């Protein structure tokens, strides 16, 4: 039956698929190589057999399939799309998550993770001829890495090596996109990542950083101040943390530049006496120092508009209180 | 007004609550057909809890107002009550044992009709209403209206003796109270027939529920010796 299915076929394929299902209930149990070739290769009935094998095979069988999919890593035979879908389905089997309410986790080895990330990159490469599919597949990588710092660092340095190898190829471009998405998803790493992503324009993508809300909190604390010296101490601590994040992770702050630009726009009208008494000059010098410490990156094209907004606020302040 | 009083009588805040209930229940109806009236009424009831209680008390007061309106508003209350009107029955008990000294005769008759309807329908908690209404009968008095009220509630209890049977403590309360009324009442042929009815009912209860009459106490013998 498998030999017939591998080889035009006509609608008779349904009968063969039914026979394969009924006489070999656990797909890939007997003669595993033929079924692995059927499910993953380089076709019309593929999703049905994939669904059968996903929801109908014992857990050791699924584990063995995962091992042989990510094991050899130098076959170039298994389709990236099918393998990624199969892994994502295996993670989200309804039996494993039965009784949950879907509110706020598997471990894999090093080489298996390297194979998986290379498979994601291959999927991105065949998709290229935007970053949508990379972000679509990225939750699987985060789930498999299981928040393991060493594993994430290993993936980061491997992707850095891949970018160094390709340079600016299509594979290099998708490696840069995946690396920047992973860095946004895992910014807790002390490394700010090499210059390769400092040249890319992926910072404006429809992506959510794991640290953006927190720097938003701190920048609100920085901007919002009154005559209180306690609030001034709070703003000084906020400037300290924001400055340390600027020197450490400059790209993250620049994504929040239009926000602080709008705040600067808002605060400019107030006359000089209340401006000095409310300590708004402290906020102005803090944001000016922060912009200075974001020196070689704030001049990019993407940050140009909010930069001009901030400079407009500064010059408006200079004109209004020139006395 | 509803309760008899004069200018010097204190402005009773409970009665003002009743007046506000009159206002909301009547002005919301606006003499429209019962269909849209109960639709809007249910909307207002389900808006919240205090307005639900206000609507229930307005329906209760309307039951004490006029016969046809009492029928229609009791229908609407049975249709729209959410919790079965248990706290409404509690407020009925409070209004009863507090304001019975000033209750008008027509309101008394319509309240008795409501009590009979509740007992016949078997609404939960009616035993409390029965025993608190029973408590208001003053012993050693021969006023015609009080005796008529006693006879009316006696008739209610006699027709619904099974409802007394399923209410264990009410058997003891009723038999003791009717023995006290028996030793109180005598003098006229109508009172003689009333005496016959009371003694027949009490003997039937005592024989059929001797085990339940055990917990009345030694004062049962005290009532027995006089009769």
């Amino acid at each position: 039956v498998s030999s017939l299915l591998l080889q035009r076929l006509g609608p008779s394929s349904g009968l063969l698929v039914d026979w394969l299902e009924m006489l070999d209930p656990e797909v890939v149990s007997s003669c595993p190589d033929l079924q692995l070739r059927l499910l993953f290769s380089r076709p019309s009935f593929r999703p049905y057999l994939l669904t059968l094998f996903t929801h109908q095979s014992s857990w050791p069988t699924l584990h063995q399939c995962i091992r042989v999919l990510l094991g050899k890593s130098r076959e170039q035979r298994f389709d990236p799309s099918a393998s990624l879908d199969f892994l994502w389905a295996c993670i989200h089997v309804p039996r494993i998550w039965q009784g949950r309410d879907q509110r706020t986790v598997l471990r894999v080895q090093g080489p298996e993770l390297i194979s998986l990330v290379e498979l994601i990159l291959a999927e991105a490469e065949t998709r290229s001829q935007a970053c949508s599919l990379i972000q679509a597949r990225l939750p699987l990588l985060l789930s498999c890495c299981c928040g393991d710092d060493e594993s994430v660092r290993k993936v980061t340095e491997h992707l850095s090596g891949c970018i160094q190898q390709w340079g600016d190829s299509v594979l290099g471009r998708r490696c840069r996109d995946l690396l920047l998405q992973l860095y946004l998803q895992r910014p807790e790493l002390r490394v700010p990542v090499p210059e390769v992503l400092l040249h890319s324009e992926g910072a404006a993508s429809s992506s959510v950083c794991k640290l953006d809300g927190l720097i938003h909190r701190f920048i609100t604390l920085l901007a919002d101040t009154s005559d209180s010296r306690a609030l001034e101490n709070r703003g000084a601590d906020a400037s300290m943390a924001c400055r340390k994040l600027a020197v450490a992770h400059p790209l993250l702050l620049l994504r929040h530049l239009p926000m602080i630009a709008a705040l600067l726009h808002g605060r400019t009208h107030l006359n000089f006496q209340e401006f000095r008494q409310q300590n708004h000059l402290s906020c102005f010098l803090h944001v000016l120092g922060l912009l200075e410490l974001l020196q070689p990156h704030v001049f990019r094209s993407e940050h140009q508009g909010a930069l001009w907004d901030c400079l407009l606020s500064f010059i408006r302040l200079l004109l209004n209180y020139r006395k | 007004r509803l309760l008899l009083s004069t200018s010097l009588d204190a402005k009773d805040e409970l009665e003002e609550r009743l007046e506000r209930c009159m206002s909301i229940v009547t002005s919301m109806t606006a003499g429209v057909s019962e269909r849209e009236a109960n639709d809007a009424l249910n909307a207002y009831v389900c808006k919240g809890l205090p307005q639900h209680e206000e609507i229930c008390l307005g329906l209760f007061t309307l039951i004490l107002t006029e016969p046809a309106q009492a029928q229609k508003c009791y229908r609407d209350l049975a249709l729209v009550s959410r919790d079965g009107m248990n706290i409404v029955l509690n407020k009925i008990n409070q209004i009863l044992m507090e304001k019975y000294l000033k209750l008008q005769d027509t309101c008394r008759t319509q309240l008795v009709w409501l009590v009979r309807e509740l007992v016949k329908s078997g609404v939960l908690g009616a035993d409390g209403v029965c025993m608190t209404f029973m408590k208001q009968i003053a012993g050693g008095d021969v006023t015609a209206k009080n005796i008529w009220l006693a006879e009316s509630v006696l008739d209610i209890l006699t027709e619904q003796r099974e409802w007394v049977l399923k209410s264990s403590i009410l058997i003891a309360m009723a038999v003791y109270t009717y023995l006290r009324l028996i030793v109180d009442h005598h003098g006229t042929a109508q009172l003689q027939a009333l005496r016959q009815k009371e003694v027949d009912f009490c003997i039937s209860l005592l024989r059929e529920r001797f085990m339940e009459c055990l917990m009345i106490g030694r004062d049962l013998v005290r009532l027995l010796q006089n009769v």
């Binding site: 349904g14 389905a89 039965q98 | 249910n42 389900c46 049975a78 249709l79 609404v123 939960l124």
Partner: protein
């Protein structure tokens, strides 16, 4: 009297003991038969919805049975808003069985309350849950609402397309999901999109059960929407001449 019987039945509902409660609940449709008075029906259904909200699961299922049986009487409901609101509150319960019973309740009530967006969102949410009972209830409710509503039909058509194309769904749930598409006859473009989806289904799922279900659903859709009947007949004849399976041929005959 109607009201006398109603409240005499109601006191059973308040009894606390489950036997009397379910007895009263299943006694309700007979009372509707005796008294088709919209005032009484409205009040009785409000009481039903209250006990459904506060009662346990078995009493909720009894109220579901009553609602399904009392189909002819529920268009005379005056306060549909409050009734469906207190019915809908149970959908937030963490208990998956209660959510399933509530979804089935909404599906039964779909005739009197279509175009209600929160109900539609509840149906759409539960369709991707993990508890199979809740998912099946969501499928049933989706069938009913798609029979009634129109915008909900195209939304569910898109969701079913991306779900069947997905790999998380098991085979049996896919079988249960396909006949939802028979209600996509609300307009021409929606029917054509459903036709493309069914063509994709028969191409990429050639086993017996789901080609059976899918081409039967296509037959019903073409029967409802007369625009695509010739191509449906042509497809049926093609499957009759080419497909070798006896069961598929016999369905083509039927």
């Amino acid at each position: 009297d109607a009201n006398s019987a109603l409240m005499e039945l109601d006191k059973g509902l308040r009894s606390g003991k489950l036997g009397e409660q379910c007895e009263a609940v299943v006694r309700f449709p007979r009372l509707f038969q005796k008294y088709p008075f919209p005032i009484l029906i409205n009040s009785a259904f409000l009481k039903l919805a209250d006990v459904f909200r506060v009662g346990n699961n078995f009493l909720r299922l009894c109220v579901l049975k009553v609602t399904q049986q009392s189909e002819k009487h529920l268009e005379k409901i005056l306060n549909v808003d409050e009734f469906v609101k207190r019915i809908f509150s149970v959908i937030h319960s963490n208990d998956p069985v209660a959510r399933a019973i509530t979804l089935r309740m909404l599906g039964s009530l779909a005739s009197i309350i279509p175009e209600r967006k929160n109900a539609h969102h509840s149906i759409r949410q539960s369709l991707d849950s993990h508890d199979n009972v809740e998912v099946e209830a969501a499928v049933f409710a989706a069938a009913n609402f798609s029979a009634q509503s129109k915008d909900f039909a195209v939304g569910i058509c898109n969701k079913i397309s991306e779900m069947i194309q997905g790999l998380a769904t098991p085979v049996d749930l896919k079988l249960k999901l396909i006949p939802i598409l028979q209600h996509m006859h609300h307009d021409a473009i929606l029917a054509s999109s459903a036709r493309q989806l069914l063509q994709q289904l028969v191409t990429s799922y050639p086993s017996t059960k789901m080609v059976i279900v899918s081409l039967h659903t296509f037959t019903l859709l073409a029967a409802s929407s007369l625009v695509d009947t010739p191509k449906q007949i042509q497809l049926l004849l093609q499957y009759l001449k080419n497909d070798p399976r006896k069961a598929v041929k016999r369905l083509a005959i039927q």
